[PDB]
């Protein structure tokens, strides 16, 4: 396989389905990336993550640079070897979680104290190299919401200068430039002119893929969709479109309808350890007393191993008892459900019936 090749096999409106080919594997799009925090997809062996259908996972840089450390992971053979996942890994660039979980900002980057460290475009790209990332994200600033037009502009402009620094850092590292891909991140808050300026700046630098940054930061679904409506068409059509940090099943469906190809979210893993299970009839909270004697599986149609073997009653008991096996089973089912959703999306676009699928999905889920 090539370092990076994105092919679009079918389209419906703004929605696309196709493949990203990389050295470590093929990614079917639209894609959902389970999140590995601290070098593990919580409560799952990598083989289980792959059995759910995942083609790629996301690695969080902030946690890994703190523990176990990026240089240590490189000394040990890289993140793939370390955690036992041999397919593609997308790594975030670290600043979103620095600003949410740990700080002093400047044009150079951000200094912060672990919940002292520094993060600059150059150091972010180097950490992602030391981890052995397949898809490297540019170092950006996720503008807070709401933002004034002046502050959104100033923030977006900084991120575009950092995008250029990220590009040059990545390109200066032969092994990284030859084997990995680099994605740029559009900013601009909710403002169409700033989103356009950001798209133009990123296309002029040139990236393998383009993320829509700065969303899912409290603006709500209607506003996120309004911004996606004008923002995604600004990005190069022939490269993947990644919506960072999204999201709930209905957010994914509407984002695909607006041209997004890639997603990640801690919702299925996080909320699964919490007791929320996704089903085609909407989410349920398995801790509710109504499930204490329910012998049905979490979802009536789900093909995952959890729904083949255990009841709602048993998983209700495990989560109420705080048992590790409850987090394992809930997480496997929820990531399998997300992957089945992505498969249904890909098949319906391929068959020119995605509009119908989206409508049917929502009528039943809600």
Ligand X SMILES: CCNc1nc2cc3[nH]c(NC)nc3cc2c(=O)[nH]1
Q: Which residues are annotated as a binding site for Zn(2+)?
A: 302, 304, 307, 333
Q: Would you say 212 or 319 has its CB closer to a second copy?
A: 319
Residue with tokens 């209700």: 316
Tell me: does residue 251 bind ligand X (CB under 6 A): no
* Residue 30 near which of ligand X, a second copy, Zn ion, none (CB within 5-8 Å, type-dependent): none
Tell me: does residue 95 bind ligand X (CB under 6 A): yes
Smallest separation (angstroms) from a second copy to the CB of 283 = 22
* Residue 214 near which of Zn ion, a second copy, ligand X, none (CB within 5-8 Å, type-dependent): ligand X
Tell me: does residue 45 bind a second copy (CB under 8 A): yes
Cis? peptide before 83, omega within 30° of 0: no
Q: Would you say 33 or 328 has its CB closer to a second copy?
A: 328
Handedness of CA 235, 164, 191, 256 (dihedral sign): positive
Q: Can 264 be counted among the known catalytic residues?
A: yes
**From the list 51, 99, 266, 325, which residue makes contact with a second copy (rule: CB under 8 A)?**
325
* Residue 95 near which of ligand X, a second copy, Zn ion, none (CB within 5-8 Å, type-dependent): ligand X
333 CB-near residues (< 8 Å, 6+ apart): 272, 277, 278, 298, 299, 302, 304, 306, 307
Q: What's the start-to-end Cα distance of the chain, in Å?
A: 42
Stretch that binds ligand X, among 44-52, 90-98, 171-179, 194-202 (CB under 6 A): 90-98
Tell me: does residue 295 bind a second copy (CB under 8 A): yes
**From the list 307, 319, 335, 342, which residue makes contact with Zn ion (rule: CB under 5 A)?**
307
Q: Can 134 be counted among the known catalytic residues?
A: no
Tell me: does residue 147 bind ligand X (CB under 6 A): no
Helix extents (H) in 102-142: 121-131
Considering only residues 208-227, where is the footprint of ligand X by CB under 6 A? 213-217
Tell me: does residue 265 bind a second copy (CB under 8 A): no
How far is residue 92 from each of residues 54, 55, 59, 86, measured CA to CA in Å?
18, 17, 7, 18
Angle at 93 between CA 88 and CA 98, to 5 degrees: 135
How far, in Å, CA of 74 to CA of 193, rounded?
41
Q: Which residues pair with 263 in a beta bridge?
A: 32, 243
Tell me: does residue 127 bind a second copy (CB under 8 A): no
Determine which one of 92, 208, 251, 261 is catalytic. Answer: 92
CB 134 within 8 A of CB 181: yes
**From the list 62, 112, 210, 314, which residue makes contact with a second copy (rule: CB under 8 A)?**
314
Tell me: does residue 313 bind a second copy (CB under 8 A): yes
Q: Considering only CA atoms, which of 82, 81, 80 is closest in space to residue 56?
A: 80
How far, in Å, CA of 312 to CA of 291, rounded?
6
Considering only residues 286-305, where is the footprint of Zn ion by CB under 5 A? 302, 304
Determine which one of 55, 208, 261, 264 is catalytic. Answer: 264
User: Mask: binding to a second copy, 25-44, rule CB under 8 A, as x and -?
Assistant: -------------xxx-xxx
Smallest separation (angstroms) from Zn ion to the CB of 209 = 30
Tell me: does residue 344 bind a second copy (CB under 8 A): no
Residue 335 is encoded by which pair of tokens?
A: 């990531």
User: Which helix H or strand E contains 117, and what residues bound it?
Assistant: strand 117-119
Tell me: does residue 328 bind a second copy (CB under 8 A): yes
Which residues are part of a known binding site for substrate? 92-96, 140, 187, 214
How far, in Å, CA of 189 to CA of 147, rounded?
7
How far is residue 18 from each of residues 3, 6, 9, measured CA to CA in Å?
17, 7, 5
Handedness of CA 74, 77, 82, 86 (dihedral sign): positive
Helix extents (H) in 24-108: 46-51, 61-66, 70-75, 79-83, 95-101
Interface residue list for Zn ion (CB under 5 A): 302, 304, 306-307, 333
Catalogue the active-site residues.
92, 264
Give me the residues that bind a second copy (CB under 8 A), please. 38-40, 42-45, 67-68, 72, 75-77, 82-84, 292-293, 295, 309-311, 313-314, 317-318, 320-321, 323-325, 327-328
């Amino acid at each position: 396989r090539p370092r990076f090749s994105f092919s679009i096999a079918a389209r419906e409106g703004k929605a696309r389905t196709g493949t990203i080919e990389m050295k470590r594997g093929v990614i079917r799009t639209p894609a959902f990336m389970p999140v590995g925090t601290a070098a593990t997809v919580k409560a799952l062996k990598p083989e289980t993550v792959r059995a759910t259908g995942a083609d790629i996972i996301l690695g969080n840089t902030y946690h890994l640079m703190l523990r176990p450390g990026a240089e240590r992971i490189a000394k040990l053979g890289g993140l793939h070897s370390f955690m036992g996942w041999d397919r593609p890994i997308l790594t975030d660039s670290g600043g979103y979680q620095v600003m949410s979980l740990s700080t002093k900002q400047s044009e150079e980057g951000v200094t912060f104290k672990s919940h002292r460290h520094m993060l600059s475009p150059e150091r972010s790209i180097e950490i992602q190299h030391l981890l052995g990332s397949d898809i490297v994200m540019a170092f950006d600033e996720c503008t807070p919401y709401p933002a004034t037009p002046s502050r959104a502009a100033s923030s977006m402009e900084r991120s575009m200068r950092w995008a250029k620094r990220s590009r040059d850092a990545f390109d200066s590292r032969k092994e990284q430039a030859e084997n990995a891909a680099l994605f740029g991140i559009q900013q601009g808050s909710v403002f169409e002119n700033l989103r356009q300026q950001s798209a133009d700046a990123l296309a002029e630098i040139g990236f393998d893929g383009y993320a829509v940054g700065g969303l899912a930061v409290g603006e709500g679904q209607d506003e996120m969709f309004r911004v996606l409506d004008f923002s995604v068409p600004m990005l190069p059509d022939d490269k993947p479109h990644y919506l960072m940090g999204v999201g709930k099943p209905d957010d994914i469906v509407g984002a695909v309808e607006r041209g997004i190809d890639m997603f990640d979210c801690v919702l299925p893993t996080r909320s699964g350890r919490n007791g929320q299970a996704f089903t085609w009839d909407g989410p349920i909270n398995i801790r509710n007393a109504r499930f204490s004697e329910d012998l049905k599986p979490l979802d009536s149609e789900c093909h995952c191993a959890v729904c083949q073997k255990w009841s709602r009653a048993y998983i209700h008991h495990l989560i109420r008892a705080g048992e590790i096996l409850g987090a394992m089973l809930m997480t496997e089912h929820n990531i399998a459900f997300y992957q089945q959703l992505m498969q249904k999306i890909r098949d319906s676009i391929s068959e020119g019936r995605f509009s119908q699928f989206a409508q049917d999905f929502r009528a039943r889920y809600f």
